[PDB]
Design an enzyme around this catalytic site. Structure first.
Site, PDB file in Angstrom:
ATOM      1  N   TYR A 266       0.765   9.995   2.611  1.00 33.53           N
ATOM      2  CA  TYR A 266       1.673  10.033   3.757  1.00 33.53           C
ATOM      3  C   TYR A 266       2.933   9.240   3.452  1.00 33.53           C
ATOM      4  O   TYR A 266       4.043   9.769   3.530  1.00 33.53           O
ATOM      5  CB  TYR A 266       0.992   9.452   5.001  1.00 33.53           C
ATOM      6  CG  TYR A 266       0.318  10.454   5.935  1.00 33.53           C
ATOM      7  CD1 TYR A 266       0.762  10.602   7.264  1.00 33.53           C
ATOM      8  CD2 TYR A 266      -0.780  11.220   5.514  1.00 33.53           C
ATOM      9  CE1 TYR A 266       0.140  11.496   8.142  1.00 33.53           C
ATOM     10  CE2 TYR A 266      -1.407  12.133   6.386  1.00 33.53           C
ATOM     11  CZ  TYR A 266      -0.937  12.259   7.696  1.00 33.53           C
ATOM     12  OH  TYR A 266      -1.538  13.148   8.564  1.00 33.53           O
TER      13      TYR A 266
ATOM     14  N   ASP B 212      -3.469   4.193  14.341  1.00 33.90           N
ATOM     15  CA  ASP B 212      -3.933   5.321  13.498  1.00 33.90           C
ATOM     16  C   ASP B 212      -4.622   6.531  14.157  1.00 33.90           C
ATOM     17  O   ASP B 212      -5.684   6.975  13.685  1.00 33.90           O
ATOM     18  CB  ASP B 212      -4.904   4.766  12.457  1.00 33.90           C
ATOM     19  CG  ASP B 212      -4.370   4.845  11.068  1.00 33.90           C
ATOM     20  OD1 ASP B 212      -4.161   5.996  10.595  1.00 33.90           O
ATOM     21  OD2 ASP B 212      -4.182   3.763  10.454  1.00 33.90           O
TER      22      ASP B 212
ATOM     23  N   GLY C  40       0.749  -1.269   0.000  1.00 38.03           N
ATOM     24  CA  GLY C  40       0.000   0.000   0.000  1.00 38.03           C
ATOM     25  C   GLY C  40       0.777   1.317   0.000  1.00 38.03           C
ATOM     26  O   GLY C  40       2.005   1.351   0.226  1.00 38.03           O
ATOM     27  N   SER C  41       0.031   2.406  -0.246  1.00 34.89           N
ATOM     28  CA  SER C  41       0.596   3.753  -0.468  1.00 34.89           C
ATOM     29  C   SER C  41      -0.404   4.905  -0.230  1.00 34.89           C
ATOM     30  O   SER C  41      -1.318   4.796   0.604  1.00 34.89           O
ATOM     31  CB  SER C  41       1.182   3.867  -1.890  1.00 34.89           C
ATOM     32  OG  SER C  41       2.533   3.438  -1.936  1.00 34.89           O
ATOM     33  N   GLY C  42      -0.208   6.005  -0.965  1.00 33.45           N
ATOM     34  CA  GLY C  42      -1.031   7.207  -0.831  1.00 33.45           C
ATOM     35  C   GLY C  42      -0.415   8.210   0.130  1.00 33.45           C
ATOM     36  O   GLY C  42       0.469   8.988  -0.242  1.00 33.45           O
TER      37      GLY C  42
ATOM     38  N   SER D 254       4.485   5.038   1.723  1.00 33.68           N
ATOM     39  CA  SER D 254       4.308   3.659   1.305  1.00 33.68           C
ATOM     40  C   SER D 254       4.794   2.697   2.379  1.00 33.68           C
ATOM     41  O   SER D 254       5.815   2.920   3.012  1.00 33.68           O
ATOM     42  CB  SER D 254       5.035   3.402  -0.017  1.00 33.68           C
ATOM     43  OG  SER D 254       5.961   4.434  -0.328  1.00 33.68           O
TER      44      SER D 254
END
Length: 330
Positions: free
Chosen positions: A31, A162, A28-30, A33
């Protein structure tokens, strides 16, 4: 000493990590990886997060620091803590990257969508509330507690990560100043209900819908709570609504353990001055098989004063470097 690092490209970037971390595979990724890795020191599966653009601006820099600081503070069984943090930088001048290493977690609690026995619902919720007792004792409010934020292993040992709006408290959802750590207790309400029934408690389409679904179950605000509202136009809106009474939870939660139902009535309260706290919920009769008051520990108090500070990029960056350097593993 300094570790031996090794370089390798994935996520279109050249990751540089200590050789103890082996077999990096993106997840995953997007802050930033993340890669799953094997930690050869400990035998653990771990998540390595490379932060993206950690010091590109002041907001990037401060947030970079807020993340590292927070993770460094959390030392609890039911809370995601920091296993390691590193940079390939050998001094502050060349410090431009940050890697965070945490326990690699199995399912989240969404994955446990497909039904749970009462004993197992007790175990999952008790762990959330134990984690929450800690977190709140440090003056940290999670704010977006939900199933995707709750990781469980095979053995269903639960960790909170989180720190959707189906689980958000209605005072947090509506920008109401009148709140409290028990905004998280509302999210635990919605989560436990769903574990009990198999369906989302308040699957609203927008914020109006959501509120409408909430008020249908819990009732429209009653005079006592109306007095706590300072906006007149807010007050007018509220009392312009078609008035709903409080429904009986027994007739929504059919065949659920009556102690679970009683507990849900104490969490799913609109007035947060009256909502049950995590500490109190741990002592509810419903967790009788898991409660032990000398093994539900509290936190060292967490200094967030940094949040009010107007600093330069370079100072958030040095401040982050200090936190990296002083880090001692578990």
């Amino acid at each position: 000493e300094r570790p031996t690092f090794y370089r390798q490209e994935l996520n279109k970037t050249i990751w540089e990590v200590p050789e103890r971390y082996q077999n990096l595979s993106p997840v995953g990724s997007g802050y930033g990886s993340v890669c799953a890795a094997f930690d050869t020191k400990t035998g653990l599966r771990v998540a390595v997060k490379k932060l993206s653009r950690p010091f590109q601006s002041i907001i990037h820099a401060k947030r970079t620091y807020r993340e590292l600081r927070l993770l460094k503070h959390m030392k609890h069984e039911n809370v995601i803590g920091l296993l390691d943090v590193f940079t390939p930088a050998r001094s502050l001048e060349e410090f431009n990257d940050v890697y965070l290493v945490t326990h690699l977690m199995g399912a989240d609690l969404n994955n446990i969508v497909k039904k749970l026995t009462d004993d197992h619902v007790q175990f999952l919720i008790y762990q959330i509330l134990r984690g929450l007792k800690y977190i709140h004792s440090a003056d940290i409010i999670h704010r977006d507690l939900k199933p995707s934020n709750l990781a469980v292993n095979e053995d269903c040992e639960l960790k909170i990560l989180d720190f959707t709006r189906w689980y958000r408290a209605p005072e947090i959802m509506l920008n109401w100043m009148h709140y409290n750590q028990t905004v998280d207790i509302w999210s635990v309400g919605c989560i436990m209900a769903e574990l009990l029934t198999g369906r989302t408690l308040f699957p609203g389409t927008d914020h109006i819908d959501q509120l409408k679904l909430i008020l249908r179950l819990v009732g429209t605000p009653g005079a006592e709570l109306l007095k706590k509202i300072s906006s007149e136009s807010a007050r007018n809106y509220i009392q312009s609504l078609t008035q709903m009474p409080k429904m009986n939870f027994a007739n929504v939660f059919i065949g659920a353990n009556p102690l679970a139902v009683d507990l849900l009535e104490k969490m799913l309260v609109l007035d947060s001055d009256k909502r049950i706290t995590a500490a109190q919920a741990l002592a509810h009769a419903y967790f009788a098989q898991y409660h032990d008051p000398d093994d539900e520990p509290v936190a060292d108090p967490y200094d967030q004063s940094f949040e009010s500070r107007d600093l330069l990029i370079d100072e958030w960056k040095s401040l982050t470097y200090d936190e990296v350097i002083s880090f001692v593993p578990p």
